Design a protein around this ligand. Structure first.
Ligand SMILES: O=C(O)C(=O)CC(=O)c1ccccc1
Ligand SMILES: [Cl-]
Ligand SMILES: [Cl-]
Ligand SMILES: [Mg+2]
Ligand SMILES: [Mg+2]
Ligand SMILES: [Mg+2]
Ligand code: NA
Ligand code: NA
Lengths: 183, 194
């Protein structure tokens, strides 16, 4: 556990590119001491790498601060009340067009298509609200089939995931030592 | 000394506020291994906390990327060629007025007043160059007498500085040991290529 956490921190500091948009989540990760919290912030760190790559590939701004669509519009001088709470992975306002980006990773075709339709529906549900406010929605769903990203060599991506999986294994191995113990 | 470095890192992670403007320098600091580089980046981290604190209390933008005044103007579409190279600690363009901020810490009254005059002159020397380009300079010099800032509790600021000083003492001993080493003689002798 201590060794796994140490190896994870070393990968984070030495083998994830120092793009400044990642620095906050790296610090969030490096600050964690509890295994369950290392795992949680490590998955989030991997996710941000994917999100920022998707934003750069899709031509918009990564939603670094988890702003809502409401805030993004207000931020740009656009009133649109009653908009449900939607926090996109990326966004870009060009003229009257609001690009909204959702991205994800899934590892089987069934889970891929399910999440693809979920994120599509999530953005689609504010199209008409945006249209009433003069904003044409440009919704983008970028589904990935693995965790490959431009900020990490493939071998270090793999080692990071292998190490996170060991923390998962220990948790699950922990409670089967709970389940054959208990009541 | 490994323990001192570890303590500085814990203070950085646990007691320096998670302001997004500090992310880069905090990460730069946490990645250092060599005692002297830990010391330099730790001092730079503390300086960054004060500079950003000053920008916030003076109502302007911290100069996150060390942009020059010329660069700040060309980003807002203002031409102005001349300009000496000047990197303010903070800036804000409002209407036709360019706020420029310099901040510093000094620990004696004589050094405080000397530095205040220096920074005041540094900014004043471009007032007319800006006025020709249509810009009213609003120059601010924020001189501080201690290291307090809003991103660190007072006790942690004190203990961070205490541990940096102990790390200074340790790296001074590393240097003296190094100057007794063959590596040092080999560095001297590499004077085969002046
Ligand atoms: O990025 C997104 O679009 C999400 O849907 C949230 C997300 O990625 C996430 C990642 C890690 C933990 C919890 C949510
Ligand atoms: Cl639809
Ligand atoms: Cl100085
Ligand atoms: Mg998201
Ligand atoms: Mg400065
Ligand atoms: Mg200064
Ligand atoms: Na609605
Ligand atoms: Na238009």
């Amino acid at each position: 556990h201590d060794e796994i956490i140490s190896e994870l921190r070393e990968l984070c500091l030495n083998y994830i590119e120092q793009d400044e948009r990642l620095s906050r989540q790296k610090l969030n990760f490096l600050g964690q001491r509890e295994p369950r919290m290392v795992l949680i912030e490590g998955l989030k760190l991997l996710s941000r790498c994917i999100e920022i790559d998707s934003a750069d590939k899709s031509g918009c701004t990564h939603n670094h601060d988890d702003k809502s669509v409401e805030t993004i519009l207000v931020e740009s001088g656009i009133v649109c009340p009653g908009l449900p709470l939607i926090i996109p992975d990326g966004y870009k306002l060009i003229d009257n067009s609001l690009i909204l980006l959702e991205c994800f990773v899934r590892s089987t075709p069934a889970s891929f298509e399910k999440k693809f339709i979920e994120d599509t529906n999530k953005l689609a549900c504010i199209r008409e609200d945006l249209a009433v406010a003069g904003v044409t929605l440009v919704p983008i769903v970028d589904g990935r089939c693995d965790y490959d990203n431009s900020f990490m060599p493939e071998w270090a991506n793999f080692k990071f995931r292998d190490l996170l999986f060991k923390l998962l294994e220990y948790s699950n191995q922990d409670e089967k030592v709970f389940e054959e113990s208990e009541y």
